[PDB]
């Protein structure tokens, strides 16, 4: 073989070039930075009314509204301040696995096992929420809808590919391929010109929304990557493995910045989120408890011990005022 | 505290939303959610037709005052089973495997499938209805040769029913724990409503047994 030898030596030497210039670990420098003590957060709100496992949840751009989707077949929009149900939408397929909130607040997108991403319009002149679009063309179950504009949306799937869709036309504007397994989560960058997606192949990658280019690839896990999120400054991203360890990678360094793992944790991370200052990495686990890690020293600075079942989705508001968490008991909890 | 004319109207709307959510959930609990499974080229467009009538394919058929929901899986291609747990609480798993399964080795794939759902923490306490529907080709290919072609476990006489018992006999060995769940195997002639009735009976027997565990008797 010729190309295989070139491919093998390319990666080994490219990694060698990365290793040669690799100076030191994050801890080696940030050791002198004092910890944050104990972040004891109390459950300020308990949003109840879902009658099944809650699979997805997305914060509003104004830091006050929430969307949650259940196996019940319902999509509920809450007022996070007064724990009031602003909207309740019946979804076509009860098998929801992801949801997103339009950054302008006009629309809401949700999808799941039926391979279709349904986009509903909230601000209708007739007062009810209708289905503006049904983005179809994926050949597998859907995940991590992430609106870019009111007329451009990304979607991951179990087809080993992500897709950028022009909602108005309903045609896949771009298709990012290269995965060898179901793609579980994607998270748009702050500037909305990139994104990172992790897949069951135990590898994630940074894709460009404009040119459909596999700009970067990232490895280091030993099992699936069930959750992913972006550092608030759009220069790092943390993935939540089913290996029971979280990993913060830097886009530029081509390497994992650090690992958040503890011996007592034997189960995989279900969702990952960040604090507005990029200090508290919030990891929802299968242990039926979330967990607040100090995102620079890897210490569990507090825990959001709640829910009777595994945590599925986390979210930190835009201003960082709260933390919404969901779990398979059908209760959302807003912690502060 | 006193509330604004609007902030009260917001609270009244939430109650109306809350009422409908609760009311809808009551209707959901009145249905029987049967997860439908099958192996490759086993015959899956013939049992669904017998009922009273892309990814997931959900089917409805109301039979004798029961509203049945049957969720097919022949649309999903990714076999990672990161979506099986979504099918917790199903009242059964209608697993369809026919006798002509060694025409396309079936032993490894078939036994690995059943060992998968009997090992899953989510399904180990749900009954598995086993279907062997037709009787039109189940006899004409048994006489070709003993089952040593792909089933080394048995090297004896191969009749229709006796060998059929062996497949069932080895089957229960797949079930790692028969304390909680129960296989309801079916050997019939796919000529009439036989299939529908058997699931109804296997659905009453699983429901009635579930009540007792709630009463603490069974």
């Amino acid at each position, epitope marked *: 073989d010729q190309l295989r030898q070139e491919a093998e030596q390319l990666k080994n030497q490219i990694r060698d070039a990365r290793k040669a210039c690799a100076d030191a670990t994050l801890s080696q420098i940030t050791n002198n930075i004092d910890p944050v003590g104990r972040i004891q957060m109390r459950t300020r709100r308990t949003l109840r009314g879902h009658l099944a496992k809650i699979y997805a949840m997305h914060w509003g751009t104004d830091s006050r509204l929430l969307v949650s989707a259940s196996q019940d077949g319902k999509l509920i929009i809450w007022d996070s301040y007064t724990t009031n149900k602003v909207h309740a939408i019946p979804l076509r397929s009860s098998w929801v696995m992801t949801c997103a909130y339009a950054p302008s607040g006009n629309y809401v997108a949700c999808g799941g096992l039926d391979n279709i991403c349904s986009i509903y319009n909230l601000k209708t002149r007739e007062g*009810n929420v209708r289905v503006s679009r049904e983005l179809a063309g994926h050949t597998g179950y859907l995940s991590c809808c992430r609106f870019l504009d009111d007329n451009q949306i990304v979607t991951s799937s179990g087809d080993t590919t992500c897709a950028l869709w022009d909602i108005e036309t309903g045609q896949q504007t771009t298709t990012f391929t290269g995965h060898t397994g179901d793609v579980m989560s994607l998270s748009l960058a702050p500037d909305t010109r990139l994104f990172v997606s992790g897949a069951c192949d135990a590898s994630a990658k940074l894709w460009d929304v404009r040119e459909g280019m596999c700009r970067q690839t990232f490895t280091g896990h030993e099992s699936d990557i069930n959750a992913i999120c972006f550092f608030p400054n759009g220069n790092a991203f943390a993935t939540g493995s089913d290996d029971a360890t979280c990993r913060l990678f830097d886009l530029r360094a081509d390497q994992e910045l650090m690992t958040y793992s503890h011996d007592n944790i034997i189960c995989g991370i279900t969702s990952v989120s960040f604090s507005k200052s990029g200090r508290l990495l919030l990891a929802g686990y299968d242990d039926f408890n979330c967990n607040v890690w100090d995102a620079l020293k890897a210490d569990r600075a507090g825990v959001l011990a709640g829910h009777d079942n595994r945590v599925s989705c986390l979210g930190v508001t835009d201003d960082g005022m709260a933390v919404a968490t969901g779990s398979w008991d059908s209760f959302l909890k807003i912690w502060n | 505290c006193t509330l604004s004319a609007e902030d009260k109207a917001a609270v009244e709307r939430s109650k109306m939303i809350d009422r409908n959510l609760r009311e809808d959930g009551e209707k959901a609990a009145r249905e029987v959610k049967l997860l439908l499974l099958g192996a490759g080229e086993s015959g899956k467009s013939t049992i669904v037709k017998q009922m009273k009538i892309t990814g997931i394919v959900e089917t409805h058929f109301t039979f004798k005052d029961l509203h049945f929901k049957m969720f097919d899986v022949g649309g999903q291609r990714s076999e990672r089973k990161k979506w099986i747990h979504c099918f917790e609480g199903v009242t059964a798993i209608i697993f369809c495997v026919a006798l002509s399964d060694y025409d396309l080795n079936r032993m490894h794939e078939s036994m690995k499938l059943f060992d998968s759902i009997c090992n899953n923490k989510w399904f180990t306490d749900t009954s598995i209805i086993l279907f062997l529907n037709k009787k039109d080709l189940f006899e004409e290919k048994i006489k070709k040769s003993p089952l040593t072609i792909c089933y080394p476990e048995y090297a004896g006489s191969n009749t229709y029913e006796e060998a059929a018992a062996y497949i069932q006999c080895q089957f229960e060995d797949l079930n790692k724990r028969k304390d909680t769940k129960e296989i309801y195997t079916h050997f019939t002639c796919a000529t009439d409503t036989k299939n529908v009735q058997f699931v109804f009976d296997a659905v009453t027997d699983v429901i009635i047994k579930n009540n007792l565990k709630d009463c603490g008797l069974f």
Partner: single-chain antibody
Framework: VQLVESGGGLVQPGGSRKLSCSASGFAFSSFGMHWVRQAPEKGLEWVAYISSGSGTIYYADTVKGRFTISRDDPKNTLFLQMTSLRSEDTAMYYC??????????????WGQGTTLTVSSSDIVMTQATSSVPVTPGESVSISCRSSKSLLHSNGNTYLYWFLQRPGQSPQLLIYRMSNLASGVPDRFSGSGSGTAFTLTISRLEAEDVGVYYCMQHLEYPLTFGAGTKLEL
């Protein structure tokens, strides 16, 4: 959306009539309804309210217990049955919808109104004047005063601005003193704090003439301003 009311006409005192508001084009059951009225060339005046689900009902203190409001949601037909009408109940009765949740414009659409004629504590909202001549291209500022401070602890200043062009029905412009309504040009802008409030119209157009109105929704009963008329 199209709300059309029927039931207007001339009725002698002491009788009883019924006004229907046959809705078409929206989710009737999700909208609370009002029956704002207007006496001839005097000003607007609220009449009744009926929330979604027919749970809440409020009446104006002038006719409380004399009018009754009923909503027929499966049919999309709202009623207001007036029992005893005096010589003061003559007015143009409008049928207004209102949807209350976090971020709604709860006075967005106003029906076409119906003419009803009869033969012969509360917050007070005051408008400074009754006529203001102006020419196109000149920015204008209208202001009305309130008795209490509308700024609720929430922060919402429940002040509503309407515009009744000659021969038409009102049309919301500012639903909470700073938020533009739907479908109105973005030149309108509202401000003001405490009791005082002002509406500023930059780059006034020819069709912006009409009797403006300011209404409060901090607490029932709903009260309307006297009415400022822009003249050209």
């Amino acid at each position: 959306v199209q709300l059309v009311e029927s039931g207007g006409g001339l009725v002698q005192p002491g009788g009883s009539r019924k006004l229907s508001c046959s809705a078409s084009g929206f989710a009737f059951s999700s909208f609370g309804m009002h029956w704002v009225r207007q006496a001839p060339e005097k000003g607007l005046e609220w009449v009744a309210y009926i929330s979604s689900g027919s749970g809440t009902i409020y009446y104006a203190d002038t006719v409380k217990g004399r009018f009754t409001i009923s909503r027929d949601d499966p049919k999309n037909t709202l009623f207001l049955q007036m029992t005893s009408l005096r010589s003061e109940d003559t007015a143009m009765y409008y049928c207004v919808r209102s949807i209350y949740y976090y971020g709604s414009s709860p006075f967005d659409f106003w029906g076409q109104g119906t003419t009803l004629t009869v033969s012969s504590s509360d917050i007070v909202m005051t408008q400074a004047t009754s006529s203001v001549p102006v020419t196109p291209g000149e920015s204008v500022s209208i202001s009305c005063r309130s008795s209490k401070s509308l700024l609720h602890s929430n922060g919402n200043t429940y002040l509503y601005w309407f515009l009744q062009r000659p021969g038409q029905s009102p049309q919301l412009l500012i639903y909470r003193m700073s938020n533009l309504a739907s479908g109105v040009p973005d030149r309108f802008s509202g401000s003001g704090s405490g009791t005082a409030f002002t509406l500023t119209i930059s780059r006034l157009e020819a069709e912006d003439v009409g009797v403006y109105y300011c209404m409060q929704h901090l607490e029932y009963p709903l009260t309307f301003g006297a009415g400022t008329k822009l003249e050209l």
